[PDB]
A paper describes a structure:
Ribosome biogenesis is a highly coordinated and complex process that requires numerous assembly factors that ensure prompt and flawless maturation of ribosomal subunits. [name] has been identified as a bacterial cold shock response protein required for the efficient processing of the [name] 5′ end during the assembly of the 30S ribosomal subunit. Here, we report cryo-EM structures of 30S assembly intermediates accumulated in an [name] null [name] strain. Cryo-EM analysis of Δ[name] 30S particles revealing the accumulation of two predominant classes of early and late intermediates allowed us to suggest that [name] participates in two stages of 30S subunit assembly and is more deeply involved in the maturation process than previously thought.
In addition, 3D cryo-EM reconstruction of the structure of mature 30S subunits purified from wild-type [name] cells was performed and the obtained data were used as a reference to evaluate structural defects in the immature particles. 30S ribosomal subunits from wild-type (wt) and ∆[name] [name] strains were purified using a published procedure with minor modifications. In the mature 30S subunit, this structural motif forms a part of the decoding center and bends toward helix 45 and the 3′ terminus of the [name]. Helix 44 is a functionally important segment of the [name] that is directly involved in mRNA decoding and the formation of two intersubunit bridges, B2a and B3.
Author numbering:
A (entry chain K): 12 to 128
B (entry chain U): 36 to 53
C (entry chain G): 2 to 151
Write the structure that this text describes.
RNA sequence: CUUGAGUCUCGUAGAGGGGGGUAGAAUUCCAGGUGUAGCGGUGAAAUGCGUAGAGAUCUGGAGGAAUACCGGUGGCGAAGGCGGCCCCCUGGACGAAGACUGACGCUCAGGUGCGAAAGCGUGGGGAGCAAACAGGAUUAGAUACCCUGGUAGUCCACGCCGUAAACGAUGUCGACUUGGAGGUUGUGCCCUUGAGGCGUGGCUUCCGGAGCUAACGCGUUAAGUCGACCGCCUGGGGAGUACGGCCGCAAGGUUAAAACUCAAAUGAAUUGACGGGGGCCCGCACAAGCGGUGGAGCAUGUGGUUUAAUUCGAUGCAACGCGA
């Protein structure tokens, strides 16, 4: 509709899921698709084979808005980080810049003392 | 760990020194 | 493994003088039957010219470009764990598998005789069908799409 | 008397302490906008969170806690310990020449004081994290590992506790005794041309013959060769336990036995070595194909049934068209 023709793509690449939200610079997330929620569930079947599913549906989810050249920045590590870049670029989009800006701390808090086995 | 990381950075200096 | 063997040296076609055609009868040999293959595959190849209607000495490959393989599964259980790891085809298999893609559906098709049943499937590739053709349709699926694990 | 020990002149380095502020990222929470059906979670899972607007995004705001990078086999401290930045007070250390006292020294039972983390006391604070406790999976069972929540505590001030694998498992102090390579911090001389070269200090990590050790190993920072003091040991268990005392709000600390029981308990290391160490390298082992068996139907043999016997042996890899 508004047809900004560009935008900053978001890849919250977590580990069990990698949801992607598409938006321009003002932070107006208009479209999004979830890798582990693209029909798929579980963990190893929510891995990046599902990330490209989410990428293609999101491309379909916002193809009505006509966004040609695409900026993308990523959060978090994980397999749902690389394959989705190629998927979204091949899915009728053009790239602007790729980065994972995952917020490393300056030793602020405590994350858990998780699995030990 | 609050006590390991000063030990591995002072052990693996056996690993990665030579 | 560590040692290697060179490719066995082969004399050319006893009839057309072309080593590539001579190798072809060697794969179809089951029950040790080249003399029968003389009345089966040599009788087939002789008919392949006029049925094609052109010189089958170098026009013989006008139906093989699509058949060109690129990848096959190599079972590297590296470190004790089987992986996909499709290695790109090296010349000692990409042409052998081309002949391995020929007579998979040409034994008991229910026709006159495989003296000329095989003489039905060959022009089909330059008539856009036959066994060698759809072989490359399935190879594209296993590679080029599993980059996260390929 | 000046060489031991100490004062002064002078600079050098430092997460050495104590008190103040201060910054930004990061988790969390709250408010706002956009718009949306999942979010999370693991070996699959539900509990959980959510259709209300969650997750995601950017906009801000509150709070608490720690200070990414430098960062180091670095540095400092008696130890415990000490990492953002800046200031205030302060403690040592080391080095350059000097000057000055004249043995002022070393060690120290008792004694005094500092003492990681838990823990306690009285008041705050409380973001994460989280014993306890809840709920969901696991398992044979699970009160555990695992997940979702989560309180005390973790933080601060004052008071207590006094412990640790408080460990270099090496008491302090001094003298002597081949070498090499680094590291960090001063300094003298040399064209520092410079980075440095030639020297000299301190602290420091790693090799190594003498020598020592049971041995590994130590090896000028000794576990070498000596000296001065102090602490401790005297088979394993019982037992760092009872009792008594002292201390502590309490938890408990310290001091510290005996009965009885066994003939070992130990330490270094050697050759086997089993691994749910590891790397390697070999073989139709796997890989890539072929040909197969297992499908049918026939012939034999093995196992069973019957029979008078259907004789006996082999019948995990290594029997079953075997003896025969």
């Amino acid at each position: 509709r508004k047809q900004v023709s560009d935008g900053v793509a978001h890849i919250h690449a977590s580990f069990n899921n990698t949801i992607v939200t598409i938006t321009d610079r003002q932070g107006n997330a208009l479209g999004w698709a979830t890798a582990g929620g693209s029909g798929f569930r579980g963990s190893r079947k929510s891995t990046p084979f599902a990330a490209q599913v989410a990428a293609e549906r999101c491309a379909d989810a916002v193809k009505e808005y006509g966004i040609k050249n695409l900026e993308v920045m990523v959060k978090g590590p994980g397999p749902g980080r690389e394959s989705t870049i190629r998927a979204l670029n091949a899915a009728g989009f053009r790239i602007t810049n790729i980065t994972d800006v995952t917020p490393i701390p300056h030793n602020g808090c405590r994350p858990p003392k998780k699995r030990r086995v | 760990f609050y006590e390991k990381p000063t030990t591995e950075r002072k052990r693996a200096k056996a690993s990665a020194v030579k | 493994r560590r040692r290697v063997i060179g490719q066995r040296k082969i004399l050319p076609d006893p009839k057309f003088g072309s080593e590539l055609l001579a190798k072809f009868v060697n794969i179809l040999m089951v029950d040790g039957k080249k003399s029968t293959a003389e009345s089966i595959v040599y009788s087939a190849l002789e008919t392949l010219a006029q049925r094609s209607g052109k010189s089958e000495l170098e026009a013989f490959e006008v139906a093989l470009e699509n058949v060109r393989p690129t990848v096959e599964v190599k079972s590297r259980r590296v470190g004790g764990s089987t992986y996909q790891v499709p290695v790109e085809v090296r010349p000692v298999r990409r042409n052998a598998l081309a002949m391995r893609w020929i007579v998979e559906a040409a034994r008991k098709r229910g026709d006159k005789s495989m003296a000329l049943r095989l003489a039905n499937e060959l022009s089909d590739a330059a008539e856009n069908k036959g066994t060698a053709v759809k072989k490359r349709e399935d190879v594209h699926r296993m590679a080029e799409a599993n980059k996260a694990f390929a």
